[PDB]
Structure formats: structure tokens, C-alpha cells
Symmetry: C3
Subunit: 116 residues, 3 copies
């Protein structure tokens, strides 16, 4: 199992969710965060005197997936979320020791396997 955390532009969210559902990746959660991506900074920011137009609203998606679905999930997000401009975001694939579905007590693979 892996926990996928993706940071994408708000204007790309709907395309991303549609692509994920199309890939059988249903269960997930999301929230708004402020972020700064790319490895760019304004001179004033690096000087520490300012931190204005450095942060922008992004959407953070958290998706638990079984091993077989890691590749399809990453590919769906990469295709849908890219604009080609700095600030597109990132995808972290995190190792997971255990997963539990609260309703059924199902664990690990069974807990993140597509309910359809």
C-alpha cells in the first residue's frame, strides 16, 4: 500500500478528479493549502525582507492505494494536472506500514482496494 499526496492547482482539480475516477481511484480526501513550488524565489524573498507573492492557493489530495494502483494513480494526476508552468505541483508516494478501513476492520490491501 502507498499513500499518495498530490499538490495541484485549483483550476486543475476537476480534471484531476475526473481522471482519477476514470482510473478506478475513488476514495480520497482533499483540502486547500498555501504553497510555493518549483525551485524559484524572488530576490526580495531570499533576502528575507519579504514573503508576499511567494505563496499561492493549491489543493492537496491524499489517496490511499494498493500497489497495483500506484502507477495508474500517478499517471492520471501527471496527465491531468500539468500546465507546463512553474507552480504545477508535486506528487509524493509515501510508504505505509498498515491501513485499516474503519467500517469493516479490513486491513492493508483489502482496505484500499477499489470497491468497484
Amino acid at each position: 500500500m502507498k499513500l499518495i499526496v498530490a499538490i495541484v492547482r485549483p483550476e486543475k482539480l476537476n480534471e484531476v478528479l475526473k481522471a482519477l475516477f476514470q482510473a478506478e481511484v475513488r476514495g480520497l480526501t482533499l483540502s486547500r493549502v498555501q504553497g510555493h513550488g518549483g525551485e524559484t524565489e524572488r530576490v526580495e524573498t531570499y533576502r528575507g525582507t519579504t514573503v508576499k507573492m511567494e505563496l499561492h492557493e493549491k489543493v492537496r489530495l491524499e489517496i490511499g492505494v494498493s500497489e497495483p494502483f500506484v502507477k495508474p494513480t500517478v499517471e492520471a494526476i501527471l496527465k491531468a494536472a500539468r500546465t507546463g508552468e512553474v507552480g504545477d505541483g508535486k506528487i509524493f508516494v509515501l510508504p505505509v506500514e498498515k491501513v485499516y478501513r474503519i467500517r469493516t476492520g479490513e486491513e492493508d490491501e483489502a482496505a484500499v482496494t477499489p470497491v468497484q
Copy 2:
């Protein structure tokens, strides 16, 4: 140490927090998130030492369950190091 990330229903949050406290699990953070239509959920993030992983997971499984689809999930993630900001040292 491990990092527990749990998604639960807002209506069950008080009960979950009460169970965690009864289990001696005190330090944690939480926030509202949108889950799965999208429905509001609460995401809890709890860093625990190894002996507290099980008690924490169980506290949440028992307090958060309603029996209806959408009760949530619990992830246990490996943590390489954890630092206590107050001391400037690992924990």
C-alpha cells in the same frame, strides 16, 4: 515512532478525541478536509511511540465506526525521526 493519519466523520470527532485521551494519547493535530460527491471529514495526524500505535488505532476504530459506508480509514506511516521543537532535540 509512527505517524497515524486517520479520516473520520465530523459527527464522531468528539467521541474519537475522548477515546484517544482515555488511551493516554494526547498530542495531535486535526483539520477539516473534503472526502470521496464530496462529504466533510476530519483528518487527524498523531505521532506515537511504538507501544502506542495499537491503542491509538483501536481507540479510533471503536469510537469512529457507525456501520454506514464512509466511516473512514486509518493509515500508519513509518517516521524516520521526530523532533520536539521545545527542546530542539529528537524524541
Copy 3:
């Protein structure tokens, strides 16, 4: 890469952000959350991807900026990351 997750006091955020931009990280996100241990106390959660050579000094920069010496200062978690992709280019690493 490693994922640094820091929970800090809101009144220390400006200082921590300054330390992060001056340290140089390959991206960060942050948001307001509620801390506990009822009554919830505001905290700011920052998530920063940092590669191995620079994890220790980046953690030290955050520690120095965020510390007050009083209970409630927060914690910093360093998590392993299996893979990381840059969306702009699609590349892994």
C-alpha cells in the same frame, strides 16, 4: 527525498518561512490546523520535500526559528518517501 512535516505556532510562522526560503527547499505547502494535548489550539502545519543531504540542516533551521522553550512549540516529523514526481515535467525524483 524525505518529507518534513512541521507543526509550529502561528506566531512563529513568519520566522519559519523566512528560514525555509533562505535555506532553499524544493517546495513547500502549509495550512492552518488545530492542535490538542475539548479545546483546540491553532497551529500551522508545513509540509516540505527535502533531499537527503539537506534534511538535517533544514530541520535545524526550522527548529531555531520555531522554538520558544515552552510546552506547545510543536514537533517536526521526517518521513521517508518512496517516490516523488514533479508535475511540471512528469519526472520522478
